């Protein structure tokens, strides 16, 4: 077709005008209609059998790189892994099996806590991650002169934490492991600002990974200073079958990538029937409140106004015999809260509202495909 294939020469030469007769418009409906269960059947056979023996031998080669990375984490370098393929099974085998026992032995008993962080999850929140880090470090919380008139308490406590840890002994006491640092909810500027200032602290060791090809566009001179990555290419052509769970693969990637409701569809498939009857009751009651309050077909994502309050919800699931009391209700709610499939917050009157963060069209699709089959 084109004479040039790669340079700016190939960019300028392949972006030509195609004529209307020269366009061969074939709809993708002219294809074998593939069921979802045989999609998973053929994919799990090729991902577990096609090139294991090259990928296993490649993983034995780059396992000899592990003391060379550990020498870099003891010198204050954050450590970014790029390449083509899934880097997830590499990253949590290096950081849990190799890295964490060998820092602890070199500081002489228990291992270093290894907070790993799934950034391919589109529901990854930076305030919940920082809630986890202050449980592990237990920093001195922020005095009144330090909270500077609606200052950001997450950023202003890291800056107190840097000045504290500039005088502590140089010992790794946390390893935060960021899978897909350029993932959908973690590529935002408030998340990167958190993790850059948190990377200045030499007492915690950053081990991160990126999949997108324009990932270095995400760090300017100030963020690349605080990070000071050393970059490592680990191409291994792994399938990424866990990253292809929060995002529908039957639609080839036009599932909007930031919903999180497609990843919720995977969570419902292996639950209790009494935990699916509750969540079905929660969806159907909020679906009543979205069609009432909005008066609008178009996609608005469900928030606190459309949510059920908690004491009214306990009456709904006691008549349908899901929950016997308030505590057994709250014990099977929190498994949805930790996966952020349901949120609990209070309004301006004290009503404790429970609500599902998905749009109306994603809420009726989810109600029919997994929940209403019983």
């Amino acid at each position: 077709a084109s004479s040039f294939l790669d340079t700016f020469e190939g960019y300028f030469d392949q972006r030509k005008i195609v004529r209307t007769n020269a366009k061969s418009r074939h709809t993708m409906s002219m294809a074998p209609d593939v069921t979802r269960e045989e999609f998973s059947l053929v994919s799990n056979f090729f991902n577990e059998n096609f090139q294991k023996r090259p990928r296993q031998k490649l993983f034995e080669i780059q396992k000899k790189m592990f003391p060379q990375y550990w020498f870099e984490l003891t010198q204050g370098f954050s450590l970014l892994f790029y390449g083509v393929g899934s880097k997830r099974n590499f990253l949590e085998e290096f950081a849990i099996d190799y890295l964490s026992p060998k820092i602890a032995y070199s500081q002489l008993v228990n291992s270093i806590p290894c907070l790993i962080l799934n950034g391919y999850n589109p529901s990854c929140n930076y305030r919940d991650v920082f809630k986890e880090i202050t449980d592990l470090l237990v920093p001195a919380e922020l005095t009144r002169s330090e909270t500077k008139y609606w200052g950001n308490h997450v950023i202003l406590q890291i800056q107190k934490m840097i000045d504290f840890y500039k005088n502590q002994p140089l010992d790794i006491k946390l390893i935060l492991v960021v899978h897909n640092l350029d993932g959908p909810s973690i590529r935002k500027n408030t998340f990167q600002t958190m993790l850059s200032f948190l990377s200045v602290i030499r007492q915690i060791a950053i081990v991160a990974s990126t999949d997108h090809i324009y990932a270095p566009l995400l760090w300017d001179n100030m963020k690349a200073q605080n990070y000071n990555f050393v970059f490592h290419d680990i191409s291994n052509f792994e399938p990424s079958t866990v990253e292809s769970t929060f995002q529908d693969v039957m639609k080839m990637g036009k599932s909007d990538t930031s919903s999180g409701a497609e990843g919720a569809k995977y969570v419902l498939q292996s639950l209790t029937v009494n935990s699916k009857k509750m969540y079905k009751l929660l969806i159907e009651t909020q679906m009543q409140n979205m069609g009432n309050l909005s008066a609008n077909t178009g996609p608005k994502r469900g928030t606190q106004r459309t949510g059920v309050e908690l004491k009214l919800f306990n009456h709904l699931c006691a008549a349908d015999f899901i929950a016997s009391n308030e505590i057994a209700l709250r014990s099977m709610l929190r498994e949805f809260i930790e996966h952020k499939m349901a949120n609990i917050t209070k309004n301006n009157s004290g009503m404790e509202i429970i609500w599902v963060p998905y749009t109306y069209a994603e809420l009726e699709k989810l109600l029919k495909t997994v929940l209403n089959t019983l």
Binding site: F4, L5, D6, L58, I61, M65, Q68, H232, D233, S235
Partner: protein, 160 residues
């Protein structure tokens, strides 16, 4: 020179003749002929693809001889300018890079690099630690063990 000559047809007996003196084997010479027969209708200069395929294959088939002997990398481009009838070497290097773009993804050029173990100039065992970024990779600052092999043989016969 033949590099400036345009829209001239190349018989199979000539594109073999260009690589018969380089002593490229059967399977290297036939896939040069097959690659020419695809693009033969769409080339501006046919001799630029013919010299570019043969040079890219002679750096791969004879890479094992080229590591020990740095003389031959100057030999082949000096031999190439006289047979394409060009004056200086800059057009010959220019036609290597242009044909390297066209056959970098092809299946036979991959199997040519796996068999002769070249991987644009390296081994596999030496290029995978160069791509991983190992600090234990080889640095070309010392002479190699096989180049010190033939230096040690030569000097002892220059001793006595």
């Amino acid at each position: 020179s033949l590099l400036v000559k345009k829209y001239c047809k190349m018989t199979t007996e000539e594109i073999i003749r260009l690589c018969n003196d380089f002593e490229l084997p059967r399977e290297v010479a036939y896939k040069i002929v097959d690659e020419y027969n695809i693009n033969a209708s769409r080339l501006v200069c046919p001799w630029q693809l013919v010299c570019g395929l043969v040079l890219n294959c002679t750096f791969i088939v004879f890479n094992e001889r080229r590591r020990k002997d740095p003389r031959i990398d100057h030999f082949i481009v000096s031999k190439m300018c006289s047979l394409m009838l060009t004056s200086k070497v800059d057009d010959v290097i220019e036609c290597v890079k242009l044909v390297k773009e066209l056959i970098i993804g092809e299946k036979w050029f991959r199997d040519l690099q796996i068999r002769y173990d070249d991987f644009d100039g390296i081994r596999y065992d030496e290029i995978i630690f160069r791509k991983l970024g190992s600090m234990l990779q080889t640095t070309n600052i010392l002479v190699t063990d096989d180049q010190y092999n033939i230096w040690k043989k030569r000097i002892e016969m220059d001793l006595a």
